[PDB]
Structures are given as structure tokens and as C-alpha cells.
Amino acid sequence: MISDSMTVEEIRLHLGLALKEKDFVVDKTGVKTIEIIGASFVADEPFIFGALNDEYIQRELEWYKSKSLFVKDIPGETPKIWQQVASSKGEINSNYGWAIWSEDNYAQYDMCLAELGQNPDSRRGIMIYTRPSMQFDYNKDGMSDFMSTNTVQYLIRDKKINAVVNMRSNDVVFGFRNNYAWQKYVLDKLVSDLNAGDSTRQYKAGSIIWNVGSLHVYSRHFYLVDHWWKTGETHISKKDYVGKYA
Amino acid sequence: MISDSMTVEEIRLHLGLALKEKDFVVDKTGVKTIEIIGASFVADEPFIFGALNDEYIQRELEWYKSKSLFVKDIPGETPKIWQQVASSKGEINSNYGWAIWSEDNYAQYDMCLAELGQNPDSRRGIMIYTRPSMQFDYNKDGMSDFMSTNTVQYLIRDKKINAVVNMRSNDVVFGFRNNYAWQKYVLDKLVSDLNAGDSTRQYKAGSIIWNVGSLHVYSRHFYLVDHWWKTGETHISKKDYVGKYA
Ligand SMILES: Nc1nc2c(c(=O)[nH]1)N[C@@H](CNc1ccc(C(=O)N[C@@H](CCC(=O)O)C(=O)O)cc1)CN2
Ligand SMILES: Nc1nc2c(c(=O)[nH]1)N[C@@H](CNc1ccc(C(=O)N[C@@H](CCC(=O)O)C(=O)O)cc1)CN2
Ligand SMILES: Nc1ccn([C@H]2C[C@H](O)[C@@H](COP(=O)(O)O)O2)c(=O)n1
Ligand SMILES: Nc1ccn([C@H]2C[C@H](O)[C@@H](COP(=O)(O)O)O2)c(=O)n1
């Protein structure tokens, strides 16, 4: 329930407990992960662990605005992770701007805006990112990119627009921070676009509720969890870290 | 989190509180509803409010097995609700057997079974019910049937298969009971099919985690919530009910 959810601080706690208990799950790539299964929490902070990176977030936003399905179109030197999951032609699936703004994905943003504009109380205000053909599209031309965001639903209650984000899979360190920045962007845009449609509406952004099948940390970031466990600091440079996960 | 979720009994409590507070939300059809927004709970009981109806549940299962998109194919006299939301030709979208078993929805069940059969720890085991074109398909030929189940993800941890059900919209009285029966059916089938594939697996059914954008009761069922609020009885016949919601 929206008003009675876990917080990000409680998510940190449960991830710390999973590491302490050595409750490891082996990733498809062979490395260890720790997870929360069926996570559900209000994103009351914009990160869980790790450093800020407004600069990558702005690059990702421009890539999303371009709607390009090719990773080289990310501004600047495209990150190694995107080069690795891309197809033989540099193609991917998970351009979230394509997902919500392309006519080839059935105009998710515009139809959600139109639905809520005609019925503010509607339960049908949703942006549908994934697709049934993803069962075969996730490795087209050799890519490795099964859509992780499934749907985001928008529910206007007491003049606040709440976003229910439904994710299959979310990396705690980079994925959550980037995805949170993106979902908050879309929510603020929907609030603004609805308010611009009619000055009587006077909507505000509500809560972003994060629901994840597997919310996980890769072994290469266990040091961030361990350092926080010991100190309460949500970030440390890998250079400065002292512990058993170097 | 799977191990630290709300229960059905807590869902009843919060629905009772919403009714007592008269926190009403007007349905698209004009009637009042009460809701939990962003509900997330373990389905530790197979119903919330209302009487059992194994007989309708078995009829719905046969309809799902047929994969028919036409409501007359529901065994017996098709319920009035299905006649009302169907198209001019008797057609709908929400045949969940079509969703997971039709090749026209990209073989969701079979691909999820194959994914988990090759990698038990996979995060990509999912059955995708809704589709991006639902933004236009929900009222094809005059129907009124926007898919309410978005995705169901299956995560095998400690040899238990957990189902994370992601729903846009769920009627507490009929919808949840019917949908729970269906999701438990699919989960038990996936457990059985995986175990039949390899006797070393020895999987068991885990928890079914229910995540709903709007989990709601229509005004025509407020009497069930009110009676439970006053007595703790999860059912009463409309005839026998005494109260302000007759
Ligand atoms: N299979 C796999 N696929 C993935 C991810 C993963 O984990 N594994 N991660 C998902 C989330 N996307 C990102 C995007 C950027 C980065 C990243 O690494 N960012 C650097 C910048 C990198 C750079 O600019 O060179 C930073 O410090 O912000 C990580 C995950 C995308 N797909
Ligand atoms: N817009 C709208 N669309 C809906 C529902 C709704 O609420 N409103 N409800 C959703 C869930 N499906 C059902 C299926 C059956 C019944 C129902 O009514 N069952 C009777 C049997 C009816 C009969 O056999 O005649 C019983 O007592 O079990 C209600 C919702 C389907 N779509
Ligand atoms: N928006 C996204 C997309 C992907 N990922 C991460 C989650 C997983 O770490 C990986 C996808 O791997 P899989 O498809 O095996 O879940 O990418 C993420 O955190 N956020
Ligand atoms: N599997 C389903 C499908 C539908 N519904 C109910 C939820 C809503 O009461 C209605 C759909 O209306 P809307 O599309 O306006 O949410 O049907 C449900 O409870 N379970």
C-alpha cells in the first residue's frame, strides 16, 4: 500500500542482511548476486548505494529523447555495459524514450495522458514498456536485452499523481539511480502536461512506488553494501574501501 | 519483500478503514469505489471478501484452456459482466489462457518454462499478458476490456517457485478470488512441468505476491466490507445483511 510501504533505508537494511547472511544467487554471467525478491517500496530517496552521476543521467535522458534503438547514439563514449548487451549492429530494446514516445510502441505516453485527461480517476492510465514478443526479441541479432521495466501505471488521487513502477529486474547500484531519475522525469512531465491542459486540475507529483521481481546487487558492488553496513555511508570510492570484498 | 509482506487479513483491515473513512473514488461507470493504491501483499488466503464459487472458477478455467476470445464460449450461461464488456461480436481481450498459451501472444507459458528449465536462477522467467497495443485494443469493436493483469514473473529461490503478479486493476470480490485461483493453477502447473522435466529439481510452489495499481471494491459490495468490519465474517448473503449499504 502506497501510504504504508518500505523506505529506501529499509531496502538498504535488507540488502545488508542478505550480504551478511551470504544469501548468494549466481547470475547468468556466473558472478554472485544478493537480492530482494518481490521488493515493493516507496522511492523516497533517488539512490540506494553508490555515487551520484548527474552527468550520465543527462546523457541517458538525451538518448531516450532521441528514441534511438542504437547504443552508439548515447552521447559521448557509450558505456561498456551498453556495448556488451547490444546486437551485432549496435541495437538494443531498452530505450525507454522509444518505449513511451515511439509510435512503434503505440504512443504510451500520449495515450496515458489522454486517458487521464478525460478521466482523472481512471485505472487505465498506464505506460506499457515490455511486450509479449519480448520472449523472442530479447536476443535479436545477438543482443542480450530482455526489457526490465514492464509497466508504469499513473493513478491520480487527492490531486497527486502516483507512479506504480513494475520492474522485472533492477540493479541496485546503477539501474535504480538511473531508472529513478527517468521515472521522476516522466512523472513531472505528466503532471506538467496535465496541468497545462487545464488550470483547474492543479495536480502535483505524488509517490513513486517501486515494485521489482529481483532487486539485486552484483558481486562487484558488494563493497558498497558492506561499507554502508559498517558505517552508514551510502558511498565509498573503490580505492578507499577496506574490507573483504576488494 | 516476499518474506515481509502484508497479509490478506491486513488488506481486509485497510479496505475496512477506507470504507469507514468514506474515502470514495468514482468509477468510470459512475458508482463509488474504495481502493488500496499500490497494494502489495502475499496472497496467503484464496479470497478477501465474498462467498466461494468453485463452480464459476472451473468454468473460467475451461474457458481459459479453450483460449477463446469470445465470451459465449464460457461454459453455460455466460455471466452478465462478460456479456457487458464484450464487443459487438462477443469478443474480448482478457482470456488469460489465450494470454499464456496462444502462439498469437508469443507462447508466454512455454518460453517461461524453457527459460527456467535452462537457468533456474533466471530473472527472465515471465509471462507477459498485456501488450503495448492495448492502448488501442481495449475497445476494439466496442468492447470495454483493457487487460488488467500486466505480467506474472516466476522466481525460483531455495527450490520454491514464487509468482510475482503485477496487476493494473483488481476487483476485490470476484476478480481477486477468480484470479487467485487461476494464478495458483498456473504456478502449480509450472512446478509440475519443471519437476517432470528433471527429477533432480524437486521444486515446490512458493508464495504468490499480489501487486495491484488499484485494488478496489464496488459500492454494490460495500455491504460485505461493512459486515466484516462489524463481525469478522468474510461473507454474508445480501438477503441476511443488516446495515447502511443495503
Ligand atoms: N546485463 C546487464 N544489462 C544491463 C545492466 C547490467 O548491469 N547488466 N544495467 C542496466 C542499467 N543501465 C546502466 C547504464 C549505465 C551504467 C554505468 O556503468 N554507468 C557509469 C557510466 C559509464 C560510462 O560513462 O562509461 C556511471 O558511473 O554512471 C550501468 C548500467 C542496463 N542493462
Ligand atoms: N468493467 C468490469 N470488467 C470486469 C469486471 C468488473 O467488475 N467490471 N470483473 C472482472 C473479473 N471477472 C469476473 C467474472 C465473473 C464475475 C461474476 O459475476 N461471477 C458470479 C457468477 C456469475 C454467473 O455465473 O452468472 C459469481 O457469483 O461467481 C465477476 C467478475 C472481469 N472484467
Ligand atoms: N532499466 C534497467 C534495465 C536493466 N537493468 C539491469 C537489471 C539486471 O541486472 C540486468 C538485466 O539482466 P536480466 O535480463 O538477466 O535480468 O540489467 C536495470 O537495472 N535497469
Ligand atoms: N482479471 C481481472 C480483470 C478485470 N478486473 C476488474 C478490475 C476492474 O474492476 C475492471 C476493469 O475495469 P478498468 O479497466 O476500468 O480498471 O475489471 C479484475 O478484477 N480482474
Numbering used by the authors:
A (entry chain A), B (entry chain A): 1 to 246
What does the paper say about this structure?
To protect viral DNA against the host bacterial restriction system, bacterio­phages utilize a special modification system – hydroxymethylation – in which dCMP hydroxymethylase (dCH) converts dCMP to 5-hydroxymethyl-dCMP (5hm-dCMP) using N5,N10-methylenetetrahydrofolate as a cofactor. Despite shared similarity with thymidylate synthase (TS), dCH catalyzes hydroxylation through an exocyclic methylene intermediate during the last step, which is different from the hydride transfer that occurs with TS. The dCH from T4 bacteriophage (T4dCH) was the first identified viral enzyme, which catalyzes the conversion of dCMP to 5hm-dCMP using mTHF and water as methyl and hydroxyl donors, respectively. Despite its low sequence identity, dCH belongs to the thymidylate synthase (TS) superfamily due to its similar tertiary structure.
Here, we report the crystal structure of the ternary complex of T4dCH (C148S/D179N mutant) bound to dCMP and THF at 1.9 Å resolution. A reasonable electron density for THF could not be obtained from crystals of T4dCH WT; therefore, the active-site double mutant C148S/D179N was used for crystallization. The THF molecule resides in a narrow and deep binding pocket formed by α-helices B, C and G. The enzymatically active cavity for hydroxymethylation is formed along to the narrow binding site of THF, which links to the dCMP binding site. The THF completely occludes the dCMP molecule from the bulk solvent [Fig. 1(c)]. The Cα root-mean-square deviation (RMSD) between the ternary and binary complex structures is only 0.26 Å, and that between the ternary complex and the apo structure is 0.39 Å. These results suggest that no global conformational changes are triggered by THF binding [Fig. 1(d)]. The closed conformation of the apo or binary complex blocks the PABA ring-binding region. THF binding induces local structural changes in Ile81 and Phe174 [Figs. S5(d) and S5(e)]. The branched side chain of Ile81 and the aromatic ring of Phe174 rotate to the outside of the active site, which opens the PABA ring binding site and simultaneously closes the dCMP binding pocket. In summary, despite the lack of a C-terminal tail, T4dCH also recognizes the same cofactor, THF, using different residues in the THF binding pocket. The main-chain nitrogen and side-chain hydroxyl oxygen of Ser94 form a polar interaction with the side-chain carboxylate of Asp145. Furthermore, a potential key water molecule (Wat1) is located within hydrogen-bonding distance of the carboxylate of Asp145 as well as the N1 atom of the pterin ring [Fig. 3(c)].
